[PDB]
Write an enzyme that holds these catalytic residues in place. Structure first.
Site, PDB file in Angstrom:
ATOM      1  CD  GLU A   1     -55.918  28.761  94.873  1.00  0.00           C
ATOM      2  OE1 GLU A   1     -56.999  29.392  94.894  1.00  0.00           O
ATOM      3  OE2 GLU A   1     -54.818  29.285  95.135  1.00  0.00           O
TER       4      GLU A   1
ATOM      5  CB  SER B   1     -53.463  32.016  94.395  1.00  0.00           C
ATOM      6  OG  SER B   1     -54.680  31.984  95.121  1.00  0.00           O
TER       7      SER B   1
ATOM      8  CG  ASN C   1     -62.296  26.928  92.937  1.00  0.00           C
ATOM      9  OD1 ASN C   1     -63.127  27.834  92.903  1.00  0.00           O
ATOM     10  ND2 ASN C   1     -61.156  27.027  93.606  1.00  0.00           N
TER      11      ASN C   1
ATOM     12  CB  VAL D   1     -57.459  30.531  98.551  1.00  0.00           C
ATOM     13  CG1 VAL D   1     -56.365  29.485  98.720  1.00  0.00           C
ATOM     14  CG2 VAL D   1     -58.834  29.871  98.650  1.00  0.00           C
TER      15      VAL D   1
ATOM     16  CG  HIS E   1     -64.296  30.524  95.166  1.00  0.00           C
ATOM     17  ND1 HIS E   1     -64.685  29.348  94.562  1.00  0.00           N
ATOM     18  CD2 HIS E   1     -65.219  30.778  96.123  1.00  0.00           C
ATOM     19  CE1 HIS E   1     -65.793  28.907  95.131  1.00  0.00           C
ATOM     20  NE2 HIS E   1     -66.138  29.756  96.083  1.00  0.00           N
ATOM     21  CG  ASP E   2     -57.732  35.725  93.933  1.00  0.00           C
ATOM     22  OD1 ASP E   2     -56.877  34.954  94.415  1.00  0.00           O
ATOM     23  OD2 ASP E   2     -57.439  36.836  93.437  1.00  0.00           O
TER      24      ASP E   2
ATOM     25  CG  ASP F   1     -82.358  42.675  92.672  1.00  0.00           C
ATOM     26  OD1 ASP F   1     -81.906  41.591  93.105  1.00  0.00           O
ATOM     27  OD2 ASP F   1     -83.305  42.740  91.858  1.00  0.00           O
TER      28      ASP F   1
ATOM     29  CG  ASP G   1     -83.104  36.781  93.403  1.00  0.00           C
ATOM     30  OD1 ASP G   1     -84.240  36.453  93.809  1.00  0.00           O
ATOM     31  OD2 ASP G   1     -82.747  37.967  93.247  1.00  0.00           O
TER      32      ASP G   1
ATOM     33  N   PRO H   1     -65.918  28.095 101.935  1.00  0.00           N
ATOM     34  CG  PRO H   1     -67.507  29.798 101.925  1.00  0.00           C
ATOM     35  CD  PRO H   1     -66.026  29.548 101.712  1.00  0.00           C
TER      36      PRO H   1
ATOM     37  CG  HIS I   1     -75.397  33.201  96.887  1.00  0.00           C
ATOM     38  ND1 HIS I   1     -75.321  32.337  97.959  1.00  0.00           N
ATOM     39  CD2 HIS I   1     -74.228  33.066  96.215  1.00  0.00           C
ATOM     40  CE1 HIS I   1     -74.160  31.709  97.937  1.00  0.00           C
ATOM     41  NE2 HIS I   1     -73.476  32.133  96.887  1.00  0.00           N
ATOM     42  CB  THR I   2     -78.770  39.238  94.463  1.00  0.00           C
ATOM     43  OG1 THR I   2     -80.007  39.818  94.028  1.00  0.00           O
ATOM     44  CG2 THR I   2     -77.619  39.871  93.701  1.00  0.00           C
TER      45      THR I   2
ATOM     46  NE  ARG J   1     -68.837  29.799  93.458  1.00  0.00           N
ATOM     47  CZ  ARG J   1     -68.841  28.494  93.217  1.00  0.00           C
ATOM     48  NH1 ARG J   1     -68.837  28.057  91.964  1.00  0.00           N
ATOM     49  NH2 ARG J   1     -68.842  27.629  94.226  1.00  0.00           N
TER      50      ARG J   1
HETATM   51  C1  HEM Z   1     -71.168  32.460 102.594  1.00  0.00           C
HETATM   52  C2  HEM Z   1     -70.773  31.231 101.943  1.00  0.00           C
HETATM   53  C3  HEM Z   1     -70.953  30.889 100.602  1.00  0.00           C
HETATM   54  C4  HEM Z   1     -71.195  29.631 100.162  1.00  0.00           C
HETATM   55  C5  HEM Z   1     -71.223  28.363 101.015  1.00  0.00           C
HETATM   56  C6  HEM Z   1     -71.350  29.686  98.736  1.00  0.00           C
HETATM   57  C7  HEM Z   1     -71.705  28.603  97.943  1.00  0.00           C
HETATM   58  C8  HEM Z   1     -71.954  28.619  96.569  1.00  0.00           C
HETATM   59  C9  HEM Z   1     -72.392  27.483  95.794  1.00  0.00           C
HETATM   60  C10 HEM Z   1     -72.698  26.081  96.313  1.00  0.00           C
HETATM   61  C11 HEM Z   1     -72.553  27.920  94.527  1.00  0.00           C
HETATM   62  C12 HEM Z   1     -73.043  27.055  93.373  1.00  0.00           C
HETATM   63  C13 HEM Z   1     -71.888  26.562  92.520  1.00  0.00           C
HETATM   64  C14 HEM Z   1     -72.327  25.605  91.426  1.00  0.00           C
HETATM   65  O1  HEM Z   1     -73.447  25.065  91.514  1.00  0.00           O
HETATM   66  O2  HEM Z   1     -71.543  25.390  90.479  1.00  0.00           O
HETATM   67  C15 HEM Z   1     -72.214  29.336  94.519  1.00  0.00           C
HETATM   68  C16 HEM Z   1     -72.349  30.187  93.423  1.00  0.00           C
HETATM   69  C17 HEM Z   1     -72.137  31.565  93.421  1.00  0.00           C
HETATM   70  N1  HEM Z   1     -71.682  32.269  94.522  1.00  0.00           N
HETATM   71 FE1  HEM Z   1     -71.502  31.631  96.429  1.00  0.00          FE
HETATM   72  N2  HEM Z   1     -71.174  30.974  98.274  1.00  0.00           N
HETATM   73  C18 HEM Z   1     -70.886  31.719  99.407  1.00  0.00           C
HETATM   74  C19 HEM Z   1     -70.520  33.071  99.351  1.00  0.00           C
HETATM   75  C20 HEM Z   1     -70.422  33.871  98.214  1.00  0.00           C
HETATM   76  C21 HEM Z   1     -69.847  35.206  98.173  1.00  0.00           C
HETATM   77  C22 HEM Z   1     -69.139  35.881  99.353  1.00  0.00           C
HETATM   78  C23 HEM Z   1     -69.952  35.639  96.874  1.00  0.00           C
HETATM   79  C24 HEM Z   1     -69.512  36.839  96.288  1.00  0.00           C
HETATM   80  C25 HEM Z   1     -69.503  38.120  96.939  1.00  0.00           C
HETATM   81  C26 HEM Z   1     -70.563  34.549  96.139  1.00  0.00           C
HETATM   82  C27 HEM Z   1     -70.972  34.597  94.810  1.00  0.00           C
HETATM   83  C28 HEM Z   1     -71.536  33.562  94.077  1.00  0.00           C
HETATM   84  C29 HEM Z   1     -72.039  33.687  92.748  1.00  0.00           C
HETATM   85  C30 HEM Z   1     -72.190  34.990  91.986  1.00  0.00           C
HETATM   86  C31 HEM Z   1     -72.393  32.457  92.311  1.00  0.00           C
HETATM   87  C32 HEM Z   1     -72.912  32.106  90.918  1.00  0.00           C
HETATM   88  C33 HEM Z   1     -71.737  31.793  90.009  1.00  0.00           C
HETATM   89  C34 HEM Z   1     -72.159  31.309  88.639  1.00  0.00           C
HETATM   90  O3  HEM Z   1     -73.376  31.265  88.367  1.00  0.00           O
HETATM   91  O4  HEM Z   1     -71.264  30.978  87.837  1.00  0.00           O
HETATM   92  N3  HEM Z   1     -70.794  33.450  96.946  1.00  0.00           N
HETATM   93  N4  HEM Z   1     -71.867  29.757  95.785  1.00  0.00           N
HETATM   94 CA   LIG Z   2     -56.004  33.721  96.233  1.00  0.00          CA
HETATM   95 CA   LIG Z   3     -81.475  39.400  92.055  1.00  0.00          CA
END
Ligand code: HEM
Ligand SMILES: [Ca+2]
Ligand SMILES: [Ca+2]
Length: 306
Positions: free
Chosen positions: A64, A52, A70, A46, A42-43, A230, A222, A139, A170-171, A38
């Site tokens: 940031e 950054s 963040n 932006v 986020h890097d 997966d 998931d 987003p 989000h898997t 993640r």
């Molecule tokens: C398409 C729009 C996306 C939105 C709106 C979004 C939103 C979020 C939100 C709301 C969380 C929860 C944060 C928290 O509760 O602290 C999160 C966690 C996460 N997101 Fe996304 N995300 C998106 C795309 C992505 C992408 C592109 C990736 C990576 C390829 C990603 C990887 C992750 C991961 C792995 C977590 C878990 C991080 C952790 O448990 O520390 N996300 N995301």
């Molecule tokens: Ca950046």
């Molecule tokens: Ca999974």
């Protein structure tokens, strides 16, 4: 042009050092792989993947880390400091923080059971952080599908496959109750739950996130394989079990004519998903990088060299 062989002569063991660091951290924190992936996302969203996001506050620019996407969410920064130090010891002033974070993201995915590939390298580190840009570009879970598409296109990812495949991140990982409270009790000021959320799963989530409860409580993205990388994430969507609004919209939005077939395709074949994920990951990792002599090779990822 970024190339996978960028450090084959200057620091051949960089990937292994990164892997070892993550392996050790995972024993005490099984969530770190997800957190690191993640951070890379986020890097890249932006000003590109320029590390950054790793910069701390200065009197001239804000970090940031205080962006809405963040703050009290992004994590794993000390782990990055650890691998950076280890890499600096092995190869002084060679590997940029931007590249380090990219490798860390790839190794994190592989360690979690995902695909294995060599990421393009050669990125350099930013000379400033962009808080306003982060608030504008990252987003949010409440985005509609058109807004999600707009957010990806805004940073250079035009393809629906980019959005659907990268959402596969989000898997695994965790999500705070705060981000789904509307879906559970009052969606779009209807006073009713989000109709696109499976009613059986709705009950489960309500038990984990009761009204007026702890909004910082964490829930698995998931429900099938919480920590394994997966294609289960897509199977969930097909059953209306995507956790956040932005997840489920890929399959249920009125504008999902182009994303539904992608969701199905990824749910049907792990290979199809993994191939698409690597393709999309490398595309995201290619967003406006600083190269050549632009930027620096940051020694301390938290501060610009002086
Ligand atoms: C398409 C729009 C996306 C939105 C709106 C979004 C939103 C979020 C939100 C709301 C969380 C929860 C944060 C928290 O509760 O602290 C999160 C966690 C996460 N997101 Fe996304 N995300 C998106 C795309 C992505 C992408 C592109 C990736 C990576 C390829 C990603 C990887 C992750 C991961 C792995 C977590 C878990 C991080 C952790 O448990 O520390 N996300 N995301
Ligand atoms: Ca950046
Ligand atoms: Ca999974």
């Amino acid at each position: 042009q970024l190339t996978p062989t960028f450090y084959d002569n200057s620091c051949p063991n960089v990937s292994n050092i990164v892997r070892d660091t993550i392996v050790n951290e995972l024993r005490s924190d099984p969530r770190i792989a997800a957190s690191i992936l993640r951070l890379h996302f986020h890097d890249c969203f932006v000003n590109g993947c320029d590390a950054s996001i790793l910069l701390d506050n200065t009197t001239s620019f804000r970090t940031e880390k205080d962006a809405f996407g963040n703050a009290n969410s992004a994590r794993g920064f000390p782990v990055i400091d650890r691998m950076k130090a280890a890499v600096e010891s092995a190869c002084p002033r060679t590997v940029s923080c931007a590249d380090l974070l990219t490798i860390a993201a790839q190794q994190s995915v592989t360690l979690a059971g995902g695909p294995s590939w060599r990421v393009p390298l050669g990125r350099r580190d930013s000379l400033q952080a962009f808080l306003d840009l982060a608030n504008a570009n990252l987003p949010a879970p409440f985005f509609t599908l058109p807004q999600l598409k707009d957010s990806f296109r805004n940073v250079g990812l035009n393809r629906s496959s980019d959005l659907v495949a990268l959402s596969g991140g989000h898997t695994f990982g965790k999500n705070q109750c705060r981000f789904i409270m509307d879906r559970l009790y009052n969606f779009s000021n209807t006073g009713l739950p989000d109709p696109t959320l499976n009613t059986t799963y709705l009950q489960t989530l309500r038990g984990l996130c009761p009204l007026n409860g702890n909004l910082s409580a964490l829930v698995d993205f998931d429900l099938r394989t919480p920590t394994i990388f997966d294609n289960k994430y897509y199977v969930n969507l097909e059953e209306q079990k995507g956790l956040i609004q932005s997840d489920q919209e890929l399959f249920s939005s009125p504008n999902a004519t182009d994303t539904i077939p992608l969701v199905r395709s990824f749910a049907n074949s792990t290979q199809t998903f993994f191939n698409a994920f690597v393709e999309a990951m490398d595309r995201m990792g290619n967003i406006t990088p600083l190269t050549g002599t632009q930027g620096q090779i940051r020694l301390n990822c938290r501060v610009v060299n002086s």
